[PDB]
């Protein structure tokens, strides 16, 4: 919903992280990466990579002479079996990938929407819903205040009425 939907673009400029903070302030404008939110995505991606390569195989032996003749009927029976096994394992591979891509993408999509909600309900009344994945803050929020918000430390109760004012007038 968040990436293919209402967040219109991704910022190429960001390099430290997957998920970003950028704000418009009078003193300065800044770009911030959230260590916690990106780390969540990276942990669940490396989890899939692990489950993918955590495969141990039973040892196998030849049933097909490479350098000698094989009787015709038994050859046909092995050919039909070896090829049917192969067909299953190719369909099982296409499933695995097409299914876990569906899921990798959407996991990534939700972790953003979760960060976005995290900020939004954190603000409570001091700000409002712009569908640019942006929040108009209705008070002067400075450079200490900006990642007061990204530390998640930010407390609405002390800006309080100032924020309600000029929202109201």
């Amino acid at each position: 919903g968040a990436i293919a939907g209402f967040l219109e673009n991704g910022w190429e400029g960001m390099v430290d992280g997957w998920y970003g903070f950028r704000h418009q302030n009078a003193q300065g404008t800044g770009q911030a990466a959230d260590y916690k939110s990106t780390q969540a995505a990276i942990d669940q991606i490396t989890g899939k990579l692990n489950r993918l390569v955590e495969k141990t195989n039973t040892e196998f032996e030849s049933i097909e002479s490479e350098f000698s003749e094989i009787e015709h009927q038994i050859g046909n029976v092995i050919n039909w079996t070896k090829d049917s096994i192969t067909d299953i394992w190719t369909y099982q591979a296409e499933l695995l990938v097409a299914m876990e891509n569906q899921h990798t993408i959407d996991m990534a999509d939700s972790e953003m929407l979760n960060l976005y909600e995290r900020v939004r309900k954190q603000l409570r009344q001091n700000a409002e819903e712009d569908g640019k994945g942006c929040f108009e803050i209705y008070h002067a929020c400075d450079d200490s205040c900006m990642e007061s918000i990204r530390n998640n430390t930010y407390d609405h109760s002390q800006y309080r009425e100032e924020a309600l004012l000029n929202r109201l007038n």
Binding site: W18, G20, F21, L49, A98, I105, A108, M112
Partner: protein, 318 residues
């Protein structure tokens, strides 16, 4: 004033597949199918024997190519395309069956049958097809029985091998079919010929057959090879009128090894657990697209050159 939220993107990003969309760009992906296999046989850690030209059958029989490899021990056995199992032209019954037992085998061991022949019999018969030093020669575990006197009839004989050992043994003998009646007459006489084999388990009758046949290795005459298992403490008897190629030693497959039919040269300084004709494979990846035919602990073969597994988010650019 404003505070924004955004994901990243990259200038160029990898393409992946999903259950609903075939075509979905993502920031990053990793290959899950392995095609960069290797070109040597990694035999570090594996005690191995490289056959060269000797075919596995030849180990048991005693062919001149495998004269180095008559007795051995390995957890891996490596066959080669140029394999030679025969000198004198012939074929073997249940050849694939016997061959497969040897390729599974972790070892081979040899015991003298101890058979003794009378004055009339000539123990040493040689063919120009099997040349050891230069001098003609014959399979190093059998013996070719012919009459010492060219005209004379073969004497009726009983030969018995008894398996004293605890484990079961594998014994091979041959039946020789001459090209022409005169040939047959010189070697074994003018009498009707019967070889009879008998054990607790095993009973059979063989008769040498004379027919004209095309020369191979320069010999129209042919030798057919037979095998069986002698159970421990069992005894097996050979009552024969001539035309028998008789064992001078017996075989005893030992343990379990890993059979490999391979064009690749050895590397005894890497390790590996998957093998094909081409080479060896070391990969973290689950699937593989090189060889439908594989041996050992190997990644499954899938009919696809590439499956990309997205390891990033949906890539949306500037």
């Amino acid at each position: 004033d404003k505070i924004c939220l955004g994901h990243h993107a990259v200038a160029n990003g990898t393409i992946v597949k999903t259950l609903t969309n075939e075509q979905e760009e993502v920031t990053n992906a990793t290959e899950t199918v392995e095609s960069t296999g290797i070109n040597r046989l990694c035999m570090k850690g594996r005690k191995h024997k490289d056959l060269g030209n000797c075919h596995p059958i030849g180990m048991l029989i005693g062919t001149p190519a495998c004269d180095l490899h008559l007795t051995g021990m390995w957890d891996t056995l490596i066959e080669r395309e140029n394999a030679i199992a025969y000198c004198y032209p012939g074929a073997t019954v249940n050849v694939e069956a016997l061959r497969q037992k040897i390729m599974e085998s972790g070892g081979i061991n040899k015991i003298s049958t101890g058979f003794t022949y009378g004055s009339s019999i000539n123990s040493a018969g040689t063919t120009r097809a099997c040349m050891r030093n230069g001098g003609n020669s014959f399979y190093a575990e059998l013996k070719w029985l012919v009459s010492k006197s060219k005209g004379q009839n073969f004497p009726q004989t009983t030969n018995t091998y008894r398996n004293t050992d605890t484990a079961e043994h594998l014994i091979m003998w041959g039946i020789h079919h001459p090209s022409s009646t005169q040939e047959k007459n010189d070697l074994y006489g003018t009498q009707s010929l019967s070889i009879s084999v008998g054990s607790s388990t095993y009973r059979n009758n063989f008769v040498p057959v004379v027919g004209a046949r095309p020369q191979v290795n320069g010999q129209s005459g042919r030798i057919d090879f037979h095998w069986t298992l002698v159970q421990p403490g069992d005894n097996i008897t050979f009552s024969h009128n001539g035309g028998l190629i008789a064992p001078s030693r017996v075989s005893k497959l030992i343990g379990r090894g890993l059979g490999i039919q391979s064009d690749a040269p050895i590397d005894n300084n890497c390790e590996s657990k998957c093998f094909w004709r081409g080479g060896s494979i070391n990969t973290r990846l689950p699937f593989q697209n090189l060889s439908p035919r594989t041996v050992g602990q190997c990644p499954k073969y899938v009919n696809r050159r590439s499956l990309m597994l997205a390891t990033g988010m949906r890539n949306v650019p500037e």
